[PDB]
Amino acid sequence: MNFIKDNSRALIQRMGMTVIKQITDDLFVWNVLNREEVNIICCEKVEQDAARGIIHMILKKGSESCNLFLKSLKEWNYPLFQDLN
Amino acid sequence: MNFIKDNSRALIQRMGMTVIKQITDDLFVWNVLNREEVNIICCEKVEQDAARGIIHMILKKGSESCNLFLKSLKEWNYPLFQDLN
Amino acid sequence: MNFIKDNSRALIQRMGMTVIKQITDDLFVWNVLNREEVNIICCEKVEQDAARGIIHMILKKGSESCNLFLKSLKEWNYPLFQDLN
Amino acid sequence: MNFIKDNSRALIQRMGMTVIKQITDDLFVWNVLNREEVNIICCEKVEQDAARGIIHMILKKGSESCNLFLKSLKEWNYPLFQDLN
Amino acid sequence: MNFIKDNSRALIQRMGMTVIKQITDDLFVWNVLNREEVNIICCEKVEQDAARGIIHMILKKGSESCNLFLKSLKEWNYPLFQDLN
Amino acid sequence: MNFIKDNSRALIQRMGMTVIKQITDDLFVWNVLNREEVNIICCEKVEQDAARGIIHMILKKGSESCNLFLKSLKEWNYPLFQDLN
Amino acid sequence: MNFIKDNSRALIQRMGMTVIKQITDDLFVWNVLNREEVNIICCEKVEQDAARGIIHMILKKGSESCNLFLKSLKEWNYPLFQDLN
Amino acid sequence: MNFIKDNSRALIQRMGMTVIKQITDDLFVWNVLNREEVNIICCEKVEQDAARGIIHMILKKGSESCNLFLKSLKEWNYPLFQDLN
Amino acid sequence: MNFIKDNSRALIQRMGMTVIKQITDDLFVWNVLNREEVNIICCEKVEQDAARGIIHMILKKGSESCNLFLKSLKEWNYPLFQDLN
Amino acid sequence: MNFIKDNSRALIQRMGMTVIKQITDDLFVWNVLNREEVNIICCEKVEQDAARGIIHMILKKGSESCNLFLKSLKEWNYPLFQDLN
Amino acid sequence: MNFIKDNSRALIQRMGMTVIKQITDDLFVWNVLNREEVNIICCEKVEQDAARGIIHMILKKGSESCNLFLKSLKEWNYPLFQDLN
Amino acid sequence: MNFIKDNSRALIQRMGMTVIKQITDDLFVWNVLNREEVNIICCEKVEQDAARGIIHMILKKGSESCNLFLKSLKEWNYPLFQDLN
Amino acid sequence: MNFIKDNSRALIQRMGMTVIKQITDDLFVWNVLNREEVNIICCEKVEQDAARGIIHMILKKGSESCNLFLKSLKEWNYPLFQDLN
Amino acid sequence: MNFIKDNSRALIQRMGMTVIKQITDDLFVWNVLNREEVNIICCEKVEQDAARGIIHMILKKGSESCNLFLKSLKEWNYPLFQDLN
Amino acid sequence: MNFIKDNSRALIQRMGMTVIKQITDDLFVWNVLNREEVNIICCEKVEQDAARGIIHMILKKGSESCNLFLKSLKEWNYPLFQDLN
Amino acid sequence: MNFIKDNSRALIQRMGMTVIKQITDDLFVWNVLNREEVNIICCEKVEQDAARGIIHMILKKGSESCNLFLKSLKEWNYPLFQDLN
Structure with missing residues (x-):
């Protein structure tokens, strides 16, 4: 995804835990991340570090699986994604 | 395996620790790698280096033992293997 | 132990911190692990990593000392060990 | 359980502390969770975090032990489970 | 102390925050633990984790300093220590 | 700053969360620490650890930026800074 | 860059993780470092070692690509770069 | 120092993080260890490993600088040093 | 290749491991180097020595096989190759 | 020592870092290994390699100095040495 | 041994360090190689060179001592020896 | 062989150790060179000298045995042999 | 330098990585060692070996360039250099 | 060159590999030494022997080609050449 | 020296690198070996070969200079020299 | 010796350096070969040539001095001498 990579500086900043x-x-419900790839993200204390944990697991997982993140970002935290565009 | 060798550039990149x-x-449960060939992989800090550690232990271990890696890649991290094809 | 090795894929998954x-x-009370081999396990953040930390310290410690783990798994977390069988 | 996993997005949302x-x-009365696996759940302040604490202790504990959660969800908080179906 | 080590399985269970x-x-009043070794114990949320925090700071602090814990356990929470014997 | 370095033993002790x-x-309002360097400090549980988190971010940030900490310590928690001198 | 080389003694000291x-x-967003050259930096535990990891990847990457580091140092951690000049 | 070397087996055991x-x-306040020799110690996760990190930086730093450790061990964690003698 | 030979002084310097x-x-994926000619390169500790290991295996392997190195240098580490021109 | 040599295949396997x-x-406390012969052992990443590092420094150091290893193996990691016999 | 000689091209390739x-x-435990004939093998950096080091020490050491290698290859790295046949 | 003789100037140059x-x-597996005619080649330090060692053992060994070299050069190091033609 | 040579036995011992x-x-900032003479030192695992790597690059580099090492040893690690005199 | 010949005793001593x-x-980039005259130098293990390998290839190659060595010695390893004068 | 010559079979075996x-x-500090006679010893890979490198440089260097080796063997690696007698 | 002469074809083949x-x-320890008759053997590069160097120095040195070779061949490299008989 070109969108996630270009906004990755702000998406590790304004995202929030x-x-x-x-x-x-x-x-996880859509079978992208298993349970142990959630525990890599959610166990990190700083909200910027868990934000680095998702995005580098998105960009390794294809381009069609980048969408299911971005569909989940337009549902949860829409005022970021409205201001991100 | 022709599949692992041709995708080895991306499998050392998008795989993840x-x-x-x-x-x-x-x-290890399927008796391919012993314990000391896991410690060569999992002790390396960069996730790209442990990815180089598995694949070069797969390609030396036959072709029928390449499958048990690839069966374990369609169970764990399927959105890579879906996008890898 | 053949039981721990064969179920080690699920015992590093469903075990829990x-x-x-x-x-x-x-x-530790039964003098299997000393204190510093507990600190290798319990200081790791992901619950799957501490589960890899116990089991690879069990399989190196004999076969009769594998039982004291498995006796402690039928007392603490029995619904796993009921479903594990 | 396929039911808990597919509805886990809403079960960490609408469940309530x-x-x-x-x-x-x-x-705990049915000997699934011991006392220390209750203290992991109930000590977390946000009701969404304790909801993540139960469900990831259910999915690790077998499939037959997923039912005793779901029997306890049709007794306590039935209007969720009526609307969940 | 042999008493604290042998009962450490129950003393991290039935102790209570x-x-x-x-x-x-x-x-702290008897100058065993300083303030920062109290903050390691009392800031942990689960009562079993703070119980692991005291006992592993007792067993490192001598054997004569194990007594001042045990004198403080026969004053505060005597019905445990009555049932512990 | 010579003042912060010499009193750093007591400033990681008596400061308080x-x-x-x-x-x-x-x-942060005076643009010294960004948001992610606050999350390194404030997410740590022990008040002595967050006190180690500020001071080692002060001493790396110049000497003129050590003052804005010390101006903020004479406003908030003056009875320490009165007794610190 | 003459600026990064001359201040490299302090930039591996006061920079911070x-x-x-x-x-x-x-x-990474500006396509200077790929992902595997970030994992060389960010996986090292000491903040001085990751600071040695960036700067020796800057000085090998041209002189015009030294600027994009220095533009990113005047945005993130300006009180260092104010005191660095 | 003969005292630190002979008790180094217990000082890497009962010391505590x-x-x-x-x-x-x-x-650090007494200018023995600089900042980067603290980050070698305090970034290690197991408390026994950080205890190996101090003592091997003491025994390389003279004999008169071994005292300032031991003066700091009779102030912080005196019940160890009382039981160590 | 005239390009690799003339820039070989800087390509063994600024390349990086x-x-x-x-x-x-x-x-290796493009069948230029086999596995044992990778192990000659990647097992050497200094990043300048592995850089001498590639380039002297390029210049012996034809001129049309020099391109596949240079295509791989415009994909991985482009800011060198941008500054190399 | 005949005991260490005959069990050296398992002692480089089940020992653990x-x-x-x-x-x-x-x-080191008993003056067998100096500091630099510890750094040969403990700096190696795989736990099997550090296990090869001790044992080949034992078998070169006499037979009476093999005992002080074996006395240290019956204190630390007794369930191996119980199962080793 | 006819088996080792005919497969020596692949056994110096797919074996692994x-x-x-x-x-x-x-x-070494079975008294075939002494210690100095291990140091000829294991000190070589490339895994193909240490594989040339064993096999040319096997073929010089009889035919009955070729078996103890091959018994050790059916225990350690069986998926090669399964695919080697 | 006319092919090896005419390209012997480049085959002692671009071949590589x-x-x-x-x-x-x-x-050796195809019984052309015995072991002692490998030790004449592989013990020489410069890669150009071992390249002179093979080719002058090829041209003395018939013309039909020149092919088995050239079949081994189209398998190992094909990009030379592609560019050699 | 007479000072570095006479204390080289202790400076390869008590120095530390x-x-x-x-x-x-x-x-490197003072242009004594280039980058590749740092990679010879800092890539070696044992801290005694990197200490042998500096000192034998000092004693070859003049006598006036021995001072800039010794000025850097009175700034970083002064309690050694205080005890070294 | 009179300069290289008179300082050849120290240039085979303090030069370094x-x-x-x-x-x-x-x-090599300036077409003085070909590749095989580098392999005579760089394959020798002792740094004094490779230093004898360059200088005796300089003094045979003219006097105007002695300069390109000495220009390369004032760029790489200037503190020798500063102290050499 | 009669002692070094008679024990030279074991001193090239149990010594260690x-x-x-x-x-x-x-x-070297006691001016017995210069720098180039250290590089003959320490550059050899096998620890038995560097042990042959010292002892044959001792036995050529007098008998009074054999002592300074043996004084350095009773300081470093005393448990060999205790068992050697 | 009749044994060494009859097996000299295989003892210059399977012996090994x-x-x-x-x-x-x-x-040398048993005063058969002096130092200069070791340097004739061990300086030859091919292991077959050093094997020709020993045996032709054995057969010239009596018959009772052939035994001390053969006693040293039943200690070092016994699986040859077991298969040689």
Whole structure:
């Protein structure tokens, strides 16, 4: 995805932990991330580090699986994604 | 395996450490890698280096033992293997 | 132990940190693990990594000392060990 | 359980703390969760985090032990489970 | 201390947070634990984790300093220590 | 700063978390620490560890930026800074 | 760059890990460092070692690509770069 | 120092991380360890490994600089040093 | 190749190990280097020595096979190759 | 020693790094290994390689100095040495 | 041995260093290779060179001593020896 | 062979040691070179000298035995032999 | 330098890696060691070997360039250099 | 050259291998030494022997080609050449 | 020396590289071996070969200079020299 | 000796350099070969040539001095001498 890579500087900044545990919920229900790739993200204390944990697991997982993150970002935390565009 | 060799440039890139410790779990349970060939992989810090550690232990171990890696890659980290095809 | 090795793929998955700090309690009281081999396990953040930390310290410690783990798994977290069989 | 996994996005959202301390009561009386796996759940402040604490302790504990959660969800908080179906 | 080590499985279970903040009070007044070794114990949320925090700071601090814990356990929470013997 | 370095043993001891989240407020408003260097400090549980987190981010940030910490310590928690001198 | 080389003794000292993971974010978005040259930096535990990891990847990458580091150092951690001049 | 070397087996065992970050505070204020030799110690996860990190930096730093460690061990964690003698 | 030979003084200097293990990945997938000619390169500790290991295996392998190195250098580590021209 | 040589295949397998840094502690306190012969062992990443590092420094150091290893193996990691016999 | 000689082209290719240090362990315990004939093998950096080091020490050592290598290859690295046949 | 003789100026130049130890592997398995005619080649330090060692042992060994070298050069180091034609 | 040569037995012993990467920082900023003579030092695993790597690059580089090492040893690791005199 | 001949006793002593592989890089780029006259130098293990290998290939190659060595010695390893004068 | 010659079979066996680089340190500080006679010893890969390198440089260097080796062997690696007698 | 002469065709073939430097160690300690008759053997590069160097120095040195070779061949490299009989 070109969108996630170009906005990755702000998506590791303004994202926030309270939506990261909600986005990685929908990424697990849709069988993208397994349980142990959630525990890599959600166990890190700083919200910027868990934001680095998702995005580098998105960009390795194809381009069609980048969408299911971005569909989960337009549902949870829409005012970021409205301002991100 | 022709599949692992041709995709080895991307499989050392998009694989990720969180699944490498999960794939080398199933490779140990199925008696492919012993314990000391897991410690060569999982002790390396960069996730790209542990990805070079598995694949060069796969390609030396036959062709029928390449499958048990690839069966473990369609279970753990399927959105890579879906996008890898 | 043949039982721990064959189920090691699921025992690093469904085990959970809340019982790992309870199993390695009973492994320390029964003088299997010393204190520094508990700190290797319990300091790791992901619950799958501490689960890899116990099991690879069990399989190196004999076969009769594998039982004291498995006796501690039928006391703490029995619904796993009921479903594991 | 396929039911808990597919509805896990909504079950960490609409569940609520007042029933989570009541469901983990029945999970303790039926010897699924011990006391220390209740203290992992009930000590977390946000009701969404304790909801993530139960469900990831259910999915690791077999499939037959997923039912005793779901029997406790049709007794306590039935209007969720009526609307969940 | 042989007594604390042998009962450490139950002392991290039945102890309880409400006495752990009272025992580590008397351990601070008697100059065993400083303030920062109380903050390691009392900031942990689960009462079993703060119980692991005291006991592993007792067993490292000599054998004569194990007594001042045990004198503080026969004053605060005597019905445990009565049933512990 | 010679003042912060010489008193750093007591400033990681008597500082306290309730003022550390107030000092790192004024350090963020004055554009010294960004948001992610606050999350390194304030997410640590022990108040001595967050006190080690500020001071080692002060001493790396110049000498003129050490003052804005010390101006924020004479406003918030003056009875320490009165007794520190 | 003459500026980075002459200040490299202090830039491996006062830089700090919390900005190094933020600078190497902007170095990746601007296509200077790929992902595996971030994992060489950010996986090292000491903040001085990750600071040696960036700067020796800057000085090998041209002189015009030294600027994009220095533009990212005047945005993230400006009080260093103000005091560095 | 003959005292630190002979008790180094127990000083890497019973020391504990909560005092190691307090001893290496006083070792930095007294200009023995610089900042990067603290980051070698305090970034290691196991408390036994950070205890190996101090003592092997003491025994290389003279004999008169071994005292300032031992003066900092009779202030912080005296019940060890009382029982160590 | 005239380009690799003339810039070989800087290509053994500014190249870096983190891209050398990535370039020799693409050189192996495209059947230029076999596995044992990668192990000559990647096992050498200094990044300048592995850079001498690739280039002297390029210049012996034809001129049309020099391109596949240079195509792999415009993909991995482009800011060198941008500044190299 | 006939015991160490005959069991050297399993002692480089089931030993584990967490006890190797504890055995080479007691080997240093008893003046068998100096500091630089510990750094040969403990700096190697794989736990099997540090296990090869001790044993080949034992078998070169006499037969009476093989005992002090074996006394340190019956104290630290007794369930191996119980199962080793 | 006719088997080792005919497969020596692949046994210096697919063998791997992680099993070569494990095979030459069992060759030393069974008194085939002494210590200095292990140091000829295991000190070579490329895994293909240590594989040339074993096999040319096997073929000089009789035919009955070729078996103890091949018994150690059916225990360590069986998926090669399964695919080798 | 007319092909080896005419290209012998470049085959002692661009060949490389890493393939010379691989070609003389296949020349030994096919019973062309014995072991002592490999030790004449592979013990020479410069890769150009071992390249002079093979080719002058090829041209003395018939013309039909020149092919088995050239079949081993189209398998190992094909990009030379592609560019050699 | 007579001072470095006479104390070279202790300077390869008590120096330590954490200051060797800091001394060779200042030796690079002052244009004594280039980058590839740092990679010879800092890539060696044992701290005694990197200490042998600096000192034998000092004694070959003049006598006036021995001072810039010794000025960097009185800034970084002064308690050694205080005890060295 | 009179300068190289008179200082050849010290230039085979204080030169060092890490610059010899860097000087013979620039001697190859400037078409003085071909590849096989580098392999005579750089394959020798002792750094004094490779230093004898360059200088006796300089003094045979004219006097105007002695300069390109000496220009490469004032760029790489200037503190020798500063102290050599 | 009669002692070194008679024990030279075991001193090239049980000595070990980690003390050989420490003994040849003290042999250089005491002006026995120059730098180039250390590089003959320490550059050899097998620890038995560097042990042959010292002893044959001792026996050529007088009998009074054999002592300074043996004084350096009773300081570094005393448990050999205790068992050697 | 009739045994060495009749097996001299295989003893110059299967012997190997790693034991030849170990046999000529024991031949020197027992005052058979002096130092200069070791340097004739061990300086030859091919292991078959050093094997021709020992045996033709054995057969000239009596018959009772042939035994001390053969006693040193039943200690070092016994699996040859077991298969030689």
